[PDB]
Design a protein around this ligand. Sequence first.
Ligand code: 657
Lengths: 110, 108
Amino acid sequence: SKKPRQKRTATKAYNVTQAFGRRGPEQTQGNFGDQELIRQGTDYKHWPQIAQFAPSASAFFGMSRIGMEVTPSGTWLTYTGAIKLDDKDPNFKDQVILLNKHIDAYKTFP
Amino acid sequence: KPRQKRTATKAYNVTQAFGRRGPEQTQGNFGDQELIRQGTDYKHWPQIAQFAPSASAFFGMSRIGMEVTPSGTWLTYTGAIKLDDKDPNFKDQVILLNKHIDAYKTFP
Ligand SMILES: Nc1nc2ccc(OC(F)(F)F)cc2s1
């Protein structure tokens, strides 16, 4: 509470589930994080290699398709986009692996 | 810098950093001419940035995917961020966002 969801920072004391809800399949529900990342948030020891893909505020509003939806639950800013991985980075294969490790990982555990 | 880490300013504007506004899948659609020219130097930039996610929230709130396409591998993201209708500034936020969403459709 108090901090708007989008400005929260997950850590061990206030983790991904607590800040952003349980992972799952539903449309506006987050799907990213294995058990380790869920429990640790930005305390995850490989967090920097994930965060390198997160957009600056400028890039979020510069790159994304932004929209607004007014529904019975309130007014929502929608966003969609895509960020290209740098295939010239020697760490590219590892980046693909790390991201894929967390995408839909929740399917494998309660 | 990697596109996602760029910061648009008067010196390096939204077009220069993030491409022309348009309808295409990997084009941005946000910003009127003033915001495009000024980026984070825009007078109401803070009132826009309040909606941008932290890195933690970006990966926490979003639906993330990975797509292999002819040009390479892309991290996809989508989600929704709720406005606080109890915020005294709510009506002003709606106006500001409406001013910038798809503004490019009206440009000369
Ligand atoms: N559900 C989705 N399918 C796709 C396919 C391609 C795409 O473009 C990209 F740039 F990411 F490659 C984005 C998406 S989101």
